[PDB]
Structure 1
């Protein structure tokens, strides 16, 4: 390790100095750092100077040097401390607060655009920067930028308009990344963001934001306390809303591949909840069977192997959804009654995905057994032959 990964010690110093991380709008993190135009608007330039000092330090700062041995902790890929990166955060707070202030008001759309660019800057900072994550975790006047992300997310959750919509997505990216770098302990602190999430779960909410949200909900669910949060209300899980978004396919604009991505994400979430150590449950099985049905139909029609990447993802999600179904089946019989209303679509899809799985080298003994448990569909009601044709 002669190279010592000095650039890895760099917190994407290039990623900071690039075109807008959000596509379009020419946010220009440099233009923001240098911009002439929340509170204490005067001395926004002093914050800018703090950020320039931070950029110089990040360029010169290699905490992740010679493999980042000083870096230590349970989290994987512990980002270099990059204490200089932290100085960037006051500036981000400035524009983020500008957007928050617009939200507080019941005109400046471009003002929100800089705010989105700043959300992106915070996104890059949470990534590859340990100090930023530690600070945001340490924080009630705790982690004021964290509260600003929460309040912004909320303002978008309702009456977002087109401007807030993208802000929802980017702030979700940040909230999730800050969580991933964070430890389990931090997750108790983000449970409040767990309070903000339901509005994003709504059917009106776009598909991308809710995909980021499913990933976030899982990362939180890693923590036990967030796990009880996974279904804070017995009558209606946030997972209940997630199943509804999965079935409803409400966002037409989303491409089918994006739906697939949300599908595998929810498969992962159902799995993570699967390892612990409602109206939401029966609905879960209904949604799982319909999703498996759509994917398995897509696979079935095609005799050709899944050469393209998305079909490969499709076969994989077919396998894993098979596993989730097998687990739900083993845990209880309630699935079958819950299965009843879509039971026909289920028993139709399951044999077909089962055989497509059967025709695989990669098969687990586990997944084959998961099918074996189920995959008992006669597929013949057996009526008289006369007058059917």
Structure 2
């Protein structure tokens, strides 16, 4: 995209830290003062290709088939990726070793640039498509993400978020066969969900978990284990919020991503299968409270999204009512808290004109 060149040359995407994309191309300071000057010259070459912007013409009409509406495949983007390797992966080595902060800032900037490239180019993804150990920058990224969750550092918090987001955005456009690669991320992703991992990383986590349920290999992974299943860590984070900031407009987002995930798992067709239902009840209440006190509809789009998660929760509990037919046995324990929320939201959903007749039958159940 021409905007991709804009993004390339832009004030530090990351808020603050004095980051210069012009340093992502030309920074004195893997090391040894050789071939990294060459990497900088290569960044300059990508800028040269970027400028002309001949590729981003007529909305990328050439590309077709899978990954439809592909971000204009950009040769220059592939070139930028190598210098990023000198950056992100170096800290990964520092990470391998039992200062680092200076490296972490450059690494975070490099990850941001990598995110932009991955999002807006059809080439860096073609690199993902190449496959293993191919796309070695992904191996470096995967190492960092797994380690980021393990260690809780002020640098660790953000890096986790960023690596997760990169993985997720890429896995989005890729084909099913190409998602069998991202499969490796599934194992490392388990650590990310736990509260100890960054909340912003946990939200991107929920996103990637929805994506997993979209993938055929990732699904089984989401409920593969006899114990846990490797899922319900997500169910537990919405119910119990491990954030001091505890901004209300984050837990709703987590639960809403998870609810979209559940509806998607339904459409696409343990004790962990059981936690999603009770957590959906809890969220149905949570989204319910915010609207109930003020009364009437949403004076906030995020409030409208909480209402959407409400309606989706009633519909998804209905699907869950049809699911494991013996819904009541597992429901009873949280049944009082859930029964408090369900029928008032039934009234509220009847009030809105938009509510569907199918959502209405779902509502009818409870």
- Interval containing the TM-score (normalised by the shorter chain): over 0.9
Question: 1:198 and 1:328, CA in 2 relative to 1: closer, same or farther beyond 3 A?
Answer: same
* Equivalence map 1:102-117=2 (5 Å): 102-117=94-109
**2:256 corresponds to 1:257:** no
Is 2:152–2:196's contact at 8 Å kept on the other side of the alignment? Answer: no
Question: What's the CA shift for 1:237?
Answer: 2.7
Is 2:235–2:276's contact at 8 Å kept on the other side of the alignment? Answer: yes
Q: Which moved more, 1:333-342 or 1:129-138?
A: 333-342
Matches of 1:75 and 1:354 in 2, distance apart?
Answer: 40
Gaps of 5+ in 2: none
Matches of 1:190 and 1:246 in 2, distance apart?
Answer: 25
Residue of structure 2 equivalent to 1:67: 59
SS at the partner of 2:123? helix
Q: Which moved more, 1:96-105 or 1:234-243?
A: 234-243
Question: What's the CA shift for 1:41?
Answer: 5.6
Is 2:152–2:197's contact at 8 Å kept on the other side of the alignment? Answer: no
Please say which structure displays the higher CA radius of gyration: 1
Question: What's the CA shift for 1:133?
Answer: 0.7
Is 2:193–2:202's contact at 8 Å kept on the other side of the alignment? Answer: yes
Question: 1:41 and 1:77, CA in 2 relative to 1: closer, same or farther beyond 3 A?
Answer: farther
Question: What's the CA shift for 1:11?
Answer: 5.4
**2:189 corresponds to 1:189:** no
Question: 1:287 and 1:24, CA in 2 relative to 1: closer, same or farther beyond 3 A?
Answer: same
Is 2:71–2:119's contact at 8 Å kept on the other side of the alignment? Answer: yes
Matches of 1:328 and 1:76 in 2, distance apart?
Answer: 33
Question: What's the CA shift for 1:27?
Answer: 1.7
Is 2:231–2:272's contact at 8 Å kept on the other side of the alignment? Answer: yes
Question: 1:326 and 1:60, CA in 2 relative to 1: closer, same or farther beyond 3 A?
Answer: same
Matches of 1:170 and 1:301 in 2, distance apart?
Answer: 36
Is 1:357–1:363's contact at 8 Å kept on the other side of the alignment? Answer: yes
Question: 1:64 and 1:335, CA in 2 relative to 1: closer, same or farther beyond 3 A?
Answer: farther
Matches of 1:338 and 1:275 in 2, distance apart?
Answer: 23
Is 2:252–2:306's contact at 8 Å kept on the other side of the alignment? Answer: yes
Is 1:172–1:212's contact at 8 Å kept on the other side of the alignment? Answer: yes
The number of residue pairs the alignment matches comes to 366
Matches of 1:76 and 1:220 in 2, distance apart?
Answer: 20
Question: What's the CA shift for 1:172?
Answer: 1.3
Matches of 1:28 and 1:179 in 2, distance apart?
Answer: 28
SS at the partner of 1:341? helix
Question: 1:300 and 1:279, CA in 2 relative to 1: closer, same or farther beyond 3 A?
Answer: same
1:29-55 C-alpha deviation (Å, 9 max, x unpaired): 212311101366631111111111112
Question: 1:29 and 1:334, CA in 2 relative to 1: closer, same or farther beyond 3 A?
Answer: farther
SS at the partner of 1:342? helix
Q: Which moved more, 1:148-157 or 1:237-246?
A: 237-246
1:119-141 C-alpha deviation (Å, 9 max, x unpaired): 00100001110011111221332
Question: What's the CA shift for 1:318?
Answer: 0.5
Question: What's the CA shift for 1:222?
Answer: 2.0
Question: What's the CA shift for 1:330?
Answer: 0.8
Is 2:145–2:163's contact at 8 Å kept on the other side of the alignment? Answer: yes
Question: 1:32 and 1:67, CA in 2 relative to 1: closer, same or farther beyond 3 A?
Answer: closer
Gaps of 5+ in 1: 1-8, 375-389
Is 1:44–1:94's contact at 8 Å kept on the other side of the alignment? Answer: yes
Matches of 2:350 and 2:185 in 1, distance apart?
Answer: 42
Matches of 1:38 and 1:255 in 2, distance apart?
Answer: 40
Is 2:9–2:22's contact at 8 Å kept on the other side of the alignment? Answer: yes
Question: What's the CA shift for 1:369?
Answer: 0.6
Is 2:318–2:362's contact at 8 Å kept on the other side of the alignment? Answer: yes
Matches of 2:21 and 2:329 in 1, distance apart?
Answer: 55
Match of residue 296, structure 2, among 294, 301, 304: 304
- Superposed CA RMSD: 1.6
1:1-38 C-alpha deviation (Å, 9 max, x unpaired): xxxxxxxx325111111122222212212123111013
**2:14 corresponds to 1:18:** no
1:105-158 C-alpha deviation (Å, 9 max, x unpaired): 113201111000000010000111001111122133221100011001011111
Residue of structure 2 equivalent to 1:92: 84
Runs of 4+ in 1 over 6 A off after TM superposition: none
SS at the partner of 1:154? helix
Question: 1:11 and 1:89, CA in 2 relative to 1: closer, same or farther beyond 3 A?
Answer: farther
Match of residue 169, structure 2, among 157, 177, 183: 177
1:291-333 C-alpha deviation (Å, 9 max, x unpaired): 1111112222222331222221111111111111110001223
Is 2:30–2:36's contact at 8 Å kept on the other side of the alignment? Answer: no
**2:329 corresponds to 1:343:** no
Matches of 1:23 and 1:335 in 2, distance apart?
Answer: 47
